Amino acid sequence: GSSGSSGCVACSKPISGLTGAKFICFQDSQWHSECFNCGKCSVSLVGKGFLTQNKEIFCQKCGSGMDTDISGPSSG
Ligand SMILES: [Zn+2]
Ligand SMILES: [Zn+2]
């Protein structure tokens, strides 16, 4: 996206380019190590495998899309 610059999606600070910092590039957006985590709990996703549903980033346990039943997790 050559139209402008940006900062860490999680804090908007300007990333120190390729100066040697530890960063992640997901969907061309910028994330820092300390800012890469499960949206539902904040556990660091740096190391562990992450999940992506509804464009959101979650941990395995939280994103466990178990095909339990077609009723239960709804108003009933
Ligand atoms: Zn940050
Ligand atoms: Zn979680």
PDB file of C-alpha atoms in Angstrom, residues 7-71:
ATOM      1  CA  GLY A   7       2.441   1.656  12.877  1.00  0.00           C
ATOM      2  CA  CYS A   8       1.842  -1.533  15.000  1.00  0.00           C
ATOM      3  CA  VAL A   9      -1.908  -2.418  14.478  1.00  0.00           C
ATOM      4  CA  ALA A  10      -2.012  -3.002  18.286  1.00  0.00           C
ATOM      5  CA  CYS A  11      -0.560   0.439  19.359  1.00  0.00           C
ATOM      6  CA  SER A  12       0.015   2.565  16.162  1.00  0.00           C
ATOM      7  CA  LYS A  13       3.726   3.230  16.990  1.00  0.00           C
ATOM      8  CA  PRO A  14       6.088   3.435  13.985  1.00  0.00           C
ATOM      9  CA  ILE A  15       7.968   0.144  13.579  1.00  0.00           C
ATOM     10  CA  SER A  16      11.782   0.591  13.315  1.00  0.00           C
ATOM     11  CA  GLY A  17      11.790  -0.650   9.677  1.00  0.00           C
ATOM     12  CA  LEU A  18      14.347  -3.468   9.370  1.00  0.00           C
ATOM     13  CA  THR A  19      16.609  -2.066  12.167  1.00  0.00           C
ATOM     14  CA  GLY A  20      16.627  -5.550  13.841  1.00  0.00           C
ATOM     15  CA  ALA A  21      13.317  -5.438  15.801  1.00  0.00           C
ATOM     16  CA  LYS A  22      11.130  -8.592  16.117  1.00  0.00           C
ATOM     17  CA  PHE A  23       7.930  -8.008  14.118  1.00  0.00           C
ATOM     18  CA  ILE A  24       5.245 -10.005  12.272  1.00  0.00           C
ATOM     19  CA  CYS A  25       3.639  -9.109   8.921  1.00  0.00           C
ATOM     20  CA  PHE A  26       0.144 -10.618   8.618  1.00  0.00           C
ATOM     21  CA  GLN A  27      -2.188  -9.368   5.850  1.00  0.00           C
ATOM     22  CA  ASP A  28       0.607  -6.808   5.055  1.00  0.00           C
ATOM     23  CA  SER A  29      -0.222  -5.149   8.432  1.00  0.00           C
ATOM     24  CA  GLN A  30       2.448  -4.716  11.151  1.00  0.00           C
ATOM     25  CA  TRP A  31       2.490  -6.434  14.577  1.00  0.00           C
ATOM     26  CA  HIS A  32       5.197  -6.517  17.276  1.00  0.00           C
ATOM     27  CA  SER A  33       6.153  -9.632  19.344  1.00  0.00           C
ATOM     28  CA  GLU A  34       4.587  -8.273  22.590  1.00  0.00           C
ATOM     29  CA  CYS A  35       1.436  -7.365  20.557  1.00  0.00           C
ATOM     30  CA  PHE A  36       0.840 -10.731  18.769  1.00  0.00           C
ATOM     31  CA  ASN A  37      -1.801 -12.509  20.956  1.00  0.00           C
ATOM     32  CA  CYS A  38      -5.295 -14.194  21.222  1.00  0.00           C
ATOM     33  CA  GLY A  39      -7.971 -11.439  21.016  1.00  0.00           C
ATOM     34  CA  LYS A  40     -10.110 -13.322  23.625  1.00  0.00           C
ATOM     35  CA  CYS A  41      -7.415 -13.678  26.310  1.00  0.00           C
ATOM     36  CA  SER A  42      -4.116 -11.924  25.316  1.00  0.00           C
ATOM     37  CA  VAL A  43      -1.886 -15.098  25.440  1.00  0.00           C
ATOM     38  CA  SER A  44       1.214 -14.525  23.311  1.00  0.00           C
ATOM     39  CA  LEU A  45       0.877 -16.285  19.946  1.00  0.00           C
ATOM     40  CA  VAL A  46       4.659 -15.895  19.299  1.00  0.00           C
ATOM     41  CA  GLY A  47       5.811 -19.554  18.997  1.00  0.00           C
ATOM     42  CA  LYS A  48       2.442 -21.366  19.144  1.00  0.00           C
ATOM     43  CA  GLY A  49       0.209 -21.853  16.083  1.00  0.00           C
ATOM     44  CA  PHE A  50      -2.636 -19.311  15.753  1.00  0.00           C
ATOM     45  CA  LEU A  51      -6.109 -19.577  14.147  1.00  0.00           C
ATOM     46  CA  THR A  52      -7.944 -17.143  11.829  1.00  0.00           C
ATOM     47  CA  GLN A  53     -11.776 -16.930  11.641  1.00  0.00           C
ATOM     48  CA  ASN A  54     -14.021 -13.885  10.852  1.00  0.00           C
ATOM     49  CA  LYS A  55     -10.698 -12.069  10.037  1.00  0.00           C
ATOM     50  CA  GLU A  56      -9.873 -12.254  13.810  1.00  0.00           C
ATOM     51  CA  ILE A  57      -6.800 -13.880  15.407  1.00  0.00           C
ATOM     52  CA  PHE A  58      -7.378 -16.478  18.146  1.00  0.00           C
ATOM     53  CA  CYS A  59      -5.614 -19.269  20.034  1.00  0.00           C
ATOM     54  CA  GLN A  60      -6.271 -23.001  19.283  1.00  0.00           C
ATOM     55  CA  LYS A  61      -8.330 -23.634  22.497  1.00  0.00           C
ATOM     56  CA  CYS A  62     -10.593 -20.581  21.911  1.00  0.00           C
ATOM     57  CA  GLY A  63     -10.862 -21.197  18.106  1.00  0.00           C
ATOM     58  CA  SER A  64     -11.728 -24.913  18.577  1.00  0.00           C
ATOM     59  CA  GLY A  65     -14.581 -25.051  16.006  1.00  0.00           C
ATOM     60  CA  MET A  66     -15.872 -28.381  17.364  1.00  0.00           C
ATOM     61  CA  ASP A  67     -18.983 -29.542  15.454  1.00  0.00           C
ATOM     62  CA  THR A  68     -20.737 -30.278  18.777  1.00  0.00           C
ATOM     63  CA  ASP A  69     -24.375 -29.655  17.792  1.00  0.00           C
ATOM     64  CA  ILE A  70     -26.583 -27.279  15.741  1.00  0.00           C
ATOM     65  CA  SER A  71     -28.207 -25.839  18.933  1.00  0.00           C
TER      66      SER A  71
END
